[model samples]
Every structure is written in structure tokens, then in C-alpha cells.
Target: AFNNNPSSVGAYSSGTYRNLAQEMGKTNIQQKVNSTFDNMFGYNNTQQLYYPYTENGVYKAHYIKAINPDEGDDIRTEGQSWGMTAAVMLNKQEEFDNLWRFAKAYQKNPDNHPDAKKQGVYAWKLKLNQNGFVYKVDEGPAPNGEEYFAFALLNASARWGNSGEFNYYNDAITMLNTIKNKLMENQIIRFSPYIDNLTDPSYHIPAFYDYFANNVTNQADKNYWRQVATKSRTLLKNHFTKVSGSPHWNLPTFLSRLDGSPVIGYIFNGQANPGQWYEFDAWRVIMNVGLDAHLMGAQAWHKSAVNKALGFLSYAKTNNSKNCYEQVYSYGGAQNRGCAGEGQKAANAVALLASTNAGQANEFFNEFWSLSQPTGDYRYYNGSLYMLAMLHVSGNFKFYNNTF
Candidate 1:
């Protein structure tokens, strides 16, 4: 256990589900959950991502590698958040707390640090260059990690109740307040504190905001959280592009403006921009939208959104198609000249959550499920996404609401 933040709003008492996986007669749901978590975090020969390490002697840390082998073993806030979310979804409380301790000690910035203008926000990355290498902290918070982490903490609180140092609900509220005040403007969410008002479609997790609206106690804050949910849904629909007058659809990765027009070649994070192409980040768009649709079940556009992206992928799967499902594509459904990887495969699996045809979805799931989790370079992002998607399709992920 860690130190405490005394005085709180108490804890939530309930939960539910859209029940798609069971309804679809998906077998081996819990089995997949166990094996995926084990393969990712359990110290088996197949487990390449997570390993245990102790720091400060008394405090235990669950270090999740952002890449394969030693050199890429740096800790990423996003990966930590993903692991925490997956753990909570699978009811792995010990793993959740261990990762949280690691984050609290190394990633969360203290209020007194020179760059720490805000409290409750976590530093984006904790770089461990290689074995025996000194740790270097990456400055500033990114919204995606914080978004998932906040949701995970809240879910953990609701699932197991608060337990001393890991006072989940209270800690969640603290992070949530900071996120709304610092990272959000008007109704839009930013990519990061250092990245201005620009938005990543991949980072827009409207489903989490929907859950927040239902759970948060404050009237005004609750209202804004609801507002964000609505706006985020609208943002996704508006940003999606169809082939001029054709029925084809594609969701761009980064939007330069809040108005939702796709941008070309904007620079950030040292890497050259992929413009509006559906490259690395855009793969998550359908997955996120699919999740929101599955959770809420009332949005008409949700079905359309899933089908559109699925249709695009479906088109790409054709033998004559320019790219394999193993490659990326342009907004108009053309192969945009890049290879697909684990991230896309995982994301596509999650998108099946919104598929109207469970039969077809299962076939896709069977194929991906048979494939091993990604290893070697860039496994961090891909493997994290693979676990997340597995949670989704396996039905391990569910809705957690505060009760009382």
C-alpha cells in the first residue's frame, strides 16, 4: 500500500453490460481473457511485455515494456494505462495495484517539480534506455494515457471498492478534475498539454466520457462530461470522409482544427506527419466508435460508422485490392503505401463489437485470435492494443457505474 489522500466522496456500488459477446454465443470468453493477460504479463516464455521489478526496496513495480528486448524496454504512460485497464477488466486487482504503484512513483509528477504546473497529471514516458541504464522522464501529460488511466481507476474502484492507499474512486476523481480543467477547452479534448488544441481521432474516447457523465457527482462537471460525450460522437461522424460523391468512407488520423477537417502534413513529436491517411493512429477510430456504439446502443450512426470502416477493410481484403489487410490505406479506400501491423489487427478485432453480423465477426476473431501477440519492435503499442481488443471481443470488458 502507498500513502493516503484522506477525505473522500466514498465509493460506487454497481455494474452492467451490453452482452454482445454472450448473445453472439462467443465461446472461450474467459479462457481468452486469462491466456491473453497471462501471455502479456505472466512471466511465461511467451510473455514478452511485462516483468516485475522492485524499487525503493519496499515498493513493488510491475514494469511493462514499451518495446521488445532490453533497449526498447522503456516505460510508456500509455502502455501502463492500457495494462491497468486490461487488468481491471479481467478482475486482476493485484496487477492493477502493482502497475499503479509504478506509475505513482515514477510517472505521476509531483506538484513541486519545475515542469509540474499541474497536479494529478502523469508524465508521458519513463524511458529505460537499456538494462542498467538511467531512467529519463519525458515531460508533460498526454491525453490518451490519462483518459484510459482515469477510466481504469474508476472501474477498479467500483469493482473492488476502495482499499486503503489505493483509494480508487477518490484518486480517479482527482485525476478527472485535473483532466477536465487542464486538457479540455470548450467541449473538445486536446492531444496533450504540450500539443495545443489539436486532436487525435484515436485518442477521442467518447465511451469513457459517457461513463464519467453517469458517475461524477458534481452537477456542472457532470453536465460537461455529458456534453463531451455528445460532441465526441458528433466529431467522429463529421470527420469521416466519403469518396467525394461515392459511398466509400475513411476516418483520418489527425484533425488540425476542432471543426473536424482533416489536415495534411502537420508536424509534432519529431516524426513526419502522415496527413489524413489512415495510418497508425487512424486504425483506432473504428474500434473506439464501435465500443461507444456497443456500450450505449442508441446511436444510429454507430452502426453506420462500424460498417463504413469495416467496409473499407472489407474492400481491402479482396484479392484484387491494392493492399493486403496487412497494409494501410488512403481515405478513399486506396492503399496509401504503408504496411499494417499488430495495432491494426487488434483494432479491427475490436471493431467487430459493433458488427451486426456476429457470424462473420467470429470468423475474423478466430483468425486473429490464432495469431500470436506481436513481438520485437513496436510491440508496445500493438501488444497493448491486442490485449485491449481481446478484452473487448472476449467480453471481459464491461460497464462499471458508481452506485449510491
Candidate 2:
């Protein structure tokens, strides 16, 4: 039990290795990830397509016009963002390459190219309002605008390894820093215009934060991230509320610190954000935070992350139903009238894997696999989160419960 026992750590670790190896192999993740890919996309050597239903001769990622009234009907935008996932997970090198080429090509289009001078950055979403063959293109969301985009970019940058990509990394980090500054200053993070939401003091920002946090080579940037974690938790503690202990889909979800106090906040767009039943991102964030906290020697935060995650699970189970938490219609409800779509998601599968007995740190691959379904955007997202989560959770001390 003490250091005097020479073989203690080895004996303990032997058991640990066996457990981990067995756990890793048995996780529902691989199947989930594969299924998610099947659901979310179709891919070949030259093309990776989403939204299987065709739009103007190509299978485009098109949302309904009636729901997206401002965007219009029959719009088919290329899913450039999700392509980054393919590069890392499926060993789909060509798919990733083609997607990257498609993204670059789309960026270069005269009518479609984002004006950095006017827009401040290049956006990701491509807007199209067309019917029967005619289509209109316009300036849309910047890829750098999304937090997950940074994850994808960073994953690509790491997986591919190049000085050329570093420039994009530099730009992305600058913006990520900017967003961190803004979020801490205001307790708000924008997930696009219709998705401006806030976090509380108790929420976990995800393990992906671990990847970005590790990339911080400067003191200021490092402190800024920790501050985001701290303040967001504080905000959640101060504000997380529920009607009779029930939460809203859009209303902020609270994440707690190790002391069981709120530290971060989560605001979800439900199905649109991922899928109808998939609240896996929230868990992934918690898993990542717990791993990061351990890695950073932030024991308090690490403990808090696990507690908060359990709390969230308890909350979700308490509130789940075929439809409507309380009939207010937002958490997983339809906006206008669209398919609730992809009930549950691959990310949730990640959470399930994290909660497994093997310890949460190694669940990235398996959870990712389990969470993915062949019916929706599971693979695209599964791959993206898998890399980010692994990069965060894997490096924690190489021990059973090491957060650092």
C-alpha cells in the first residue's frame, strides 16, 4: 500500500492494462462510429456527400427552406466542415483530400468567396436559393466562426502535419482566443445568429478544450482558457435553472466544478446542433474537461467534471420522452415542422462509453463508434469529436484515473 511495496504500482498497472485493453476492444464505439458514417454521409475517392437526398443533380447538405425561411428552398450547400472527420477516423485519406479540395475550390469561387475585409473572416455555410436548376449563391458563415471548426482544423493540422496549415491554425487560434475573451467577458458564446447561448459556472466545455488548451504555448492564452472554464462554471452556478427540476433544450445547462458548484454552461440547439436525441457533445465536453483537469493537476476541476456529468445524465434521463419535455417545445422540439431527425446521436454514445467502468479517459474511440449511426450525420461528427477527444483524454498521465 506504500512506496515500500516495490511491486505495487506494477501489479496495479498490470491489472489496469488488461482492463483497458479489454475495455477498449469491447466498447460500442467502433460500431457506433461506423454506423454514424453510414447515416451521416456517402463517400468515394473524389467526393464525400451529406444529405443523401439529391439537390440539383448532386447530393447536397440541404436543410428545409420553410424552416430556414431566410435561407430559402432547394438550397444545396456542400458539407465541407464534416469532411475533416473523414481524414482522421475512417482512414479515408482520399475522402478527406477531396473534401479539402472541394472546400478550397468553394472558397475560391468568385460569387461564393467570403470577403475578409467585409466579413472579418471566411465563413463556412454556403447559402443557395434555387429551384429546378437555377441557384443563387451568397456570402455565408465563416468556418472559423464555429468552435467545432477549430477542432476539425486542429485535428487536420495535427493529422496532416504541415507548416502550410499552420497559417490556418494561427488564424483559427487568434479567433478562438477572441471568442474565449468574448465568452468570458459576457458569459455568452455564439453558435451562429439563431444560436447565441450562454454557459454557467458548472458546465464542462468538453474535452476538446483540452486539445486547444494544450496547443496554448503562451501564458496569457493558457490562463485565458482556464479563465473561460472558471467563469463559465461560475455563471452556470449563478444562473442554471429548471422548471420543477426540468430543463429546456435551448435554456442553458449547468456544469459543476469538483466541489459540485457550477463552472460551465451548455446551451444546445437540439437536433439542428447534432441530432434530436444526441446530447453527446455535452458529455464529450464533460469527459474532455475531466481529462484536462486531471492533466493540469486541477484536481478540483477534475472531480467537479465527473460530478457534473453524472448530474447531466440524471437530468437527461429524468426528462426524456417520445416528444416534448414539458411541451414548451425547444430542447428537442420542432421549430416549424421538420423531422425531429436522428433520435439520439453518436455523441451520446460517447457519453455512454465514458460512463463505462474502464474509466472515462479512453472512451473516445469506442464512444465515438457507438454514438455514430448509419442514419444521419453520425460519422462526420463522430470522426471530428473522436480526434479531438482522444487528443485531450489520451495524454492524461497514462494511468487509471489521471486527470493531468
Candidate 3:
């Protein structure tokens, strides 16, 4: 049902965004967006990840637990950040506020902590206490979580303003400053503040960095984010060129150094093999490339990078679509593992923004459309990506800064 047009969509500066679903007469996808939102945020208890936390019959806050009944559960900063971003994009003010409140209360580092200098940044992982009422910090902060947390707060500021229950603008600035001082090294974002000399390729969200530069008031911080954005793109292009999926390229979960060389057999922040291969975190890189191209237009290579990154999706076309969406892969397109997943599928569809190949984009979008809401042990990661991907591909993810 794709309309098969290149359409008139231009860069963010051009003030145009082509909603592929809407232009192609595929507005039906919005219902799925709503349904997935319901699944994660409300109703559909079986697939639900967001939960209400209360103390002694009093209302407290909400959180998105990293739902993996098989692998166990925790409160993940990545999930919280994504939940806020999704709620803001969906214009759900209450949900965004609730998620933000929970994160600020439980996940963000406190001044008395050993790493209090990085106080505004959030702890990446946390465990629920007895009665599901309290949380314990699991480890240090993950840079990607802080990045999205800042990005979502910025979005919330523009969408809902600062005079209400929270000052979203100032809070986001605090986060940006925290990230700049703690998580970044030599213009590269570390995988986590605690883990030096390593960076996660998928975590380099240049599009968000551009917004930081545009919105931040301090001239030095402005210049810093601008450079970070530039570094992110250069690093991504380098990674795109060197890694596996050669004529078509993708990133491993981590790069050993700033230059994007593949990292093998290294423990990062207590997690093993996360840096060595294409896995859970790497799927977001494709969508990041698409968004940078669509929003910034500063990098001309994004179109090529996005198209090539999708080379692996050829399997989805050739094999049974239901069976091809394995959760893990070698950068070389082999060593695929796990069962079907919606995260990769959603990532591929979001690439439609930068892809020039209409037929190919439609093929990916169709595959994404055919998939169901994420369920099972993978809902946390898969559904989080699905929310943002749906918003972007549907053109619902927009800049509210201008509107305010």
C-alpha cells in the first residue's frame, strides 16, 4: 500500500517531513501506535512493562521495568528515558511527568553518592526492593540513557512548558551539562561514565546532539554539543565503512576506541560480549542515521549509510519474515541468534526517512507493519524502540520548540 513516491520531504531546516504512512495511505499504523502505547503504558497487563509504585495505599509514581521474565527484571534508565521520550512524542503529558518523577527520585544520582559530581546523570540499572516500593542502584550511569533523558526533557519543555509541576527546560540543561562533564571524553561519549576508552556506536545519537547545540544557552556548551554532533557523524561514517555487512554496513554494539574499530572480547560495565557484536543495542544505530539525515541534513552520506546498513534485511525479504528477525547477529551478517524480535524490524522501518529507495523502504515498512506488539521477555527493549520508531516513521515525532 505504499504510495511509491520519493515525495517532497526535505531536511528539518526545510520545514518538511514526509509521513510515509500518511502519504502512502497507511494511516492504519497509528492505531498500532496507540495500541502499543496502551500495551506498554496501560491496559494489556500481560505485555505491560510500565507499573505503578505506591507506598502504604498512597499514590507514588510510575516506572517502566525492564521486563524479561526469563532473564529477570530491573528498572533501567534506558527504559525510563525512552518512556519519557515516547510519552512526549505521543503528547501524553501525565505519563511523561510520572516517568520523569520516578527517574528523578530513584534513578538519578544523589549528591551524597560517591560519584556525586555526576549527580544529574542517572544510574543505568536498578533493582526493585521489597513490596516493589524502593529501588537500589545496580551500577554507574550509561551515557545513552542520559542522552535520551536530556533529549526527552528538552522535548517535554517545548511540548508542555516549564510553569507546571516541573521545569523541564532547566532540568534538561542540568542533564546536558552532566553528560558533557562526566560521560564525554575527547568529543566521544563513553559507553558509561565508569567505563573509559569505550563507546557504543548505537548510543551516538547525533540528531539529539544537534538539538542540544541549538537550544543550550551557554556559548561553550553550545560549541561543545556542536562538536559532539560532528564527531558522532564522523565516527558513524567510519564505523559504517569498516564494520561487517560490507557493501551494506552495520555497527557492532561497541567500539574499542573513539575511531570505531571493532572491540572483541571485552567486559564493559560488568556486561560481557556487549561490545563485540551486533546485538540488542546496535539496532538503534540505523534509526539514528536516518534521523540525523532527516533532521540535520548536515551530512550527505546519511542516505548511503542508511541504505547500506539495511543490507541485512535482505534476509527478511528472502526468508520467512516471521523467522528471520533474530535478536543477535555478527557484523558480517552471520552468527544470527535468538528468535524473532520487533526492535530490529522497527529500526529498519525508521530508516525510511533517509532511504532514497522507495521500494526498499516500503518493503521494510511493510515488514514492520506486519509485526505485532512486542511481547515475551523482549518487550522492554523491543517495545521501547518500537515506540520511537512508530513516532518517527509516522511523522508524529516533531520539534515542539518552534511551537512553544
Candidate 3 local lDDT, 1-404, one digit each (tens): 54333333435567676576775567576787787788888856666878887788888888898876765588888899989988998889999899999989888888567665466678777876666657666657877888988999998988778999999998998888888888888889987666667788888878788788888887898898999988988888777766746522454454556787767666644575645677777777878877776677624467666766665556543554455646666554445576547888888788767777777776788888777777777778888887788888777776655232
Error of 3 at 335 (Å): 2.7
lDDT of 2 by residue, 199-247 (tens): 3221344334544665667777766665655554443333333211333
Query: What is residue 46's positional error in candidate 1, in angstroms?
Result: 2.5
Candidate 2 regions off by >4 Å?
A: 1-82, 89-94, 97-118, 122-124, 128-145, 163-168, 174-188, 191-206, 233-345, 353-372, 376-404
What lDDT tens digits, residue by residue, belong to model 1 across residues 1-404?
A: 10111111111212344334454556676776678788888776454677676544544678677764645456778888889998998888889998988887778877676664446678776775445432646667777888888899999898999866698998888778878877776678876666655677778878789788877888998898989988887777777643222433454554445666666555575544555666777778878876775566535465566666666666666743444564555555556454556677778767766666555466555556666776667777788888888787655678687686
What local lDDT does model 3 show for residue 147? 90
Error of 3 at 374 (Å): 1.8
Q: Cα deviation in Å at residue 181, candidate 1?
A: 1.9
- Models 1 onward score TM values of 0.85, 0.50, 0.90
Q: Judging by TM-score against the true structure, name the best candidate.
A: 3
lDDT of 2 at 26: 49
Q: On a 0 to 1 TM-score scale, where does candidate 3 land against the true structure?
A: 0.90
Clashes of each: 2, 61, 1
